């Protein structure tokens, strides 16, 4: 009706004003400023360890706070906690639903979370007097499939589902403290800020949104992509984050600038990006692709600094340790490989 | 030498035990067929669910027939993009389908002259020619044959398929809709579409599922071992 058309015109005017403001704040591209920096050599990451034991496609992984314990889910109905230093298996968590699509590790090292098509985020307790891993709480309420879970503390977890919503949970109560709405498509990946007050979520609508955890309101929207955003990761500094799409391009956005900074793409690269993770210093933007290898990107020069090709199938997981010691890559071949830079 | 402390050796033993448990669980899981029930909204899904046997997600109904324990996955509750979760079902041995015969005369809820049978045909196209399922055999079950028999007596199938130049009897009509749902396949060389009309009884249909999965596992094992 007339009111709907008027509201649509008002929204279009607001979008035009926002675009004009972003253009006005755009003076020089990030490449020109970093044109004079010394470029990195050829990163020659080599497989230092391999981790076998899974019997199906590994879908997610996460590193612990101590940079030594890692947890991976592989749609075999198992959540294996590995000791990266000695390849030994600390635990083997049996899963009620074998369609786990995400996994997480609490920063305190006491809990591990998982979820999938069951619409349920299962919080597991590792430090139990009984010695076995039990289900502390089964968070329910999401209509769509869970895509990624991350721990804020031992009593709070933020989860993104396929019902175009992101939710913050209280594990003790089991109720959704705050529900984040605003996405038109399915939310596929989220990354928490180092200071744990904000988090970005990438959705199928080719947009990235910043949320305030306490306020429960979307602060900014980031567009520019042409396909679904399947990965996201904050810069260590917390003032920027990188996105992964199915259009074979990884993009870095700045929070304060509220606009695009640099596009990471190559002509020979045609497959999408599944996972993205920055390094300790933020110079390397590690990204896993579907062409069976993970490519190392110069986060300040858009130059391919190396290739991590050791997998026989699609790379579905990635993670850089808290201390920057090593990187971990999970792929559908039921293999996790730990990589490190040769001295 | 060993260079392993007492705790390191004990941790190695615990890791070996966990690996043994994983191997045993994988052995149990491999000898267990997985079926994915896809289909329209109410295209005989319930009847299939009844005869073969918290959150709006995957419903896993497990049923056994002559030591061939199955796990049949109803995923008709995920109201999300299919291309974002259909990649989880890669090792599925069947993509069991349920198509309603009465949909030929009915129209979709959002009435725009969109035949429900045509919608089922459209759904079949996106699953029979999907990029992932290149060696998965569909067990398409043409449901509600009785209603089709009654409805074909008065309502002509021409309103559903204009080109159809047969009679108005169940025989020719069914033969034609079965042919139409079977010709959408573009990779007949690799996979097959085992068709079957759902019987009123709840005892002979599951036999067809048994037979179809037996044939497909035979073919899978044979090609994996290597004969073609």
């Amino acid at each position, epitope marked *: 009706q007339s009111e709907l058309d008027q509201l649509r015109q008002e929204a279009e005017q607001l979008k035009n004003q926002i675009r004009d403001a972003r253009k006005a704040c755009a003076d020089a591209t990030l490449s020109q400023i970093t044109n004079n920096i010394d470029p990195v050599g050829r990163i020659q990451m080599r497989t230092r360890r391999t981790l076998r034991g899974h019997l199906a496609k590994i879908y997610a992984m996460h590193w612990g706070t101590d940079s030594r314990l890692l947890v991976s889910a592989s749609q075999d109905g198992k959540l294996i906690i590995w000791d990266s230093y000695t390849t*030994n298996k600390v635990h083997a968590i049996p899963l009620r639903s074998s369609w786990v699509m995400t996994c997480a590790y609490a920063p305190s090292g006491n809990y591990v979370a998982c979820g999938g098509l069951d619409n349920i985020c299962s919080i597991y307790n590792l430090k139990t007097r*009984e010695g076995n891993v039990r289900v502390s709480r089964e968070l329910a309420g999401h209509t769509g499939y869970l895509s990624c879970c991350r721990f804020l503390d031992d009593n709070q977890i933020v989860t993104s589902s396929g019902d175009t919503t992101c939710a913050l949970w209280d594990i003790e109560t089991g109720q959704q403290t705050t529900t984040f709405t605003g996405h038109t498509g399915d939310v596929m990946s989220l990354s928490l800020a180092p200071d744990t007050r904000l988090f970005v979520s990438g959705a199928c609508d080719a947009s990235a949104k910043l949320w305030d955890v306490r306020e429960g309101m979307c602060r900014q929207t980031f567009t520019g992509h042409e396909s679904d955003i399947n990965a996201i990761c904050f810069f260590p500094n917390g003032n920027a984050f990188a996105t992964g799409s199915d259009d074979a391009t990884c993009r870095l956005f700045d929070l304060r600038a509220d606009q695009e900074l640099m596009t990471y793409s190559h002509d020979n690269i045609i497959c999408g990006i599944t996972s993205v993770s920055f390094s300790k210093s933020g110079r390397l933007l590690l990204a896993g692709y579907d062409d069976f290898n993970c490519n190392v990107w110069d986060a300040l020069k858009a130059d391919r600094a190396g290739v991590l090709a050791g997998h026989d199938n699609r790379v579905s997981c990635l993670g850089v340790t808290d201390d920057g010691m090593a990187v971990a890559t999970g792929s559908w071949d039921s293999f996790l490989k730990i990589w490190n830079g040769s001295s | 030498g060993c*260079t392993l402390s*007492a705790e390191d050796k004990a941790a190695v033993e*615990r890791s070996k035990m966990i690996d043994r448990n994983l191997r045993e669980d994988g052995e149990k899981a491999a000898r267990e067929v997985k079926l994915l029930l896809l289909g329209a909204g109410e295209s005989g899904k319930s009847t299939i669910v009844k005869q073969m046997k918290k959150t709006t997600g995957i419903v896993e109904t497990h049923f056994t027939f002559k030591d061939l324990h199955f796990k049949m996955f109803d995923v008709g509750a995920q109201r999300s993009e299919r291309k974002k979760w259909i990649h989880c079902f890669e090792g599925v041995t069947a993509i069991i389908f349920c198509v309603a015969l009465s949909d030929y005369d009915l129209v979709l809820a959002e009435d725009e002259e969109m035949n429900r049978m045509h919608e089922s045909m459209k759904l079949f196209d996106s699953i029979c020619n999907n990029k992932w399922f290149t060696d998965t055999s569909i067990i398409l079950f043409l449901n509600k044959k009785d209603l089709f028999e009654e409805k074909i007596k008065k309502s002509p199938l021409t309103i559903c398929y204009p080109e159809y130049a047969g009679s108005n009897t169940y025989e020719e009509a069914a033969a034609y809709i079965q042919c139409q749902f079977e010709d959408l396949n573009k990779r007949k060389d690799t996979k097959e579409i085992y068709t079957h009309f759902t019987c009123s009884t709840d005892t002979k249909n599951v036999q067809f599922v048994f037979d179809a999965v037996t044939d497909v596992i035979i073919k899978n094992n044979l090609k994996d071992c290597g004969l073609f």
Partner: single-chain antibody, 232 residues
Framework: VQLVESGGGLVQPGGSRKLSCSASGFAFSSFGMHWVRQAPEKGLEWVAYISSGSGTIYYADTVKGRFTISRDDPKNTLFLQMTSLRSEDTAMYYC??????????????WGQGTTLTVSSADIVMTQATSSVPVTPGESVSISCRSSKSLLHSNGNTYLYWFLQRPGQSPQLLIYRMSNLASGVPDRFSGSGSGTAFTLTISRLEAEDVGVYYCMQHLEYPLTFGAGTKLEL
């Protein structure tokens, strides 16, 4: 978590006996079991150990061959088949639980213990002090020394601290020389470099009087210290 043991009593020397430890409230299969003996008015002494899944079984030098340790995972029971008993075996035997992994807490739970009465390369542990008078509210320290450095190449130091309250089974206080167990207050702390290890009890009060034992876990023939007695 609860362990009860039975089968003890007066036995004629040269006979045989069978001790049983009943497990309840925890996953007995994933846990390794130990037997620790304590002679009357003497120190602890390790007896046997069976790994989870019965993969490896070790024994002490003084009891090799005679003692037979086995477990029955389905029924949650630990056994100790004992034959040819001498006068030196008079002690009250304990059933000790210990799981081993990264971050694990070995020797965490100690059973009540059944009483039994009859009518080298091992890392020697020395506790120079034997009796330290204490006063409530004061901070006391206990020293324990080893012949061989316990610091392994992997960064771990395998020395454990135990507390035996009078008439009670010992409870774990500090494992691996720095980590505090679960349920023990923060007032307990330990340190040391590679041979001299000290445990500091800041703001000592009641329920802290007892005998403190230091044990190594580098080489499997574990040796317990003489033990220090705190007098109030």
């Amino acid at each position: 978590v609860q362990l009860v043991e039975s089968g003890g009593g007066l036995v004629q020397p040269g006979g045989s006996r069978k001790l049983s430890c009943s497990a309840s409230g925890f996953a007995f299969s994933s846990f390794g079991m130990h037997w620790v003996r304590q002679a009357p008015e003497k120190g602890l002494e390790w007896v046997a150990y069976i790994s989870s899944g019965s993969g490896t079984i070790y024994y002490a030098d003084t009891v090799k061959g005679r003692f037979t340790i086995s477990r029955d995972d389905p029924k949650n029971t630990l056994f100790l088949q004992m034959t040819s008993l001498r006068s030196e075996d008079t002690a009250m035997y304990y059933c000790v639980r210990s799981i081993y992994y990264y971050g694990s807490s070995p020797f965490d739970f100690w059973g009540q213990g059944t009483t039994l009465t009859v009518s080298s390369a091992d890392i020697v542990m020395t506790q120079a002090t034997s009796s330290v008078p204490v006063t409530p509210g004061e901070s006391v320290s206990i020293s324990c020394r080893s012949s061989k450095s316990l610091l392994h190449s992997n960064g771990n130091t395998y020395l454990y601290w135990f507390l035996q309250r009078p008439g009670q089974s010992p409870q774990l206080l500090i494992y691996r020389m720095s980590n505090l167990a679960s349920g023990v207050p923060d007032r307990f702390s330990g340190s040391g470099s590679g041979t001299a290890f000290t445990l500091t009890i800041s703001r000592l009060e009641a329920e802290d009087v007892g005998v403190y034992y230091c044990m190594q876990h580098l080489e499997y023939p574990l040796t317990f210290g003489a033990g220090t007695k705190l007098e109030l």
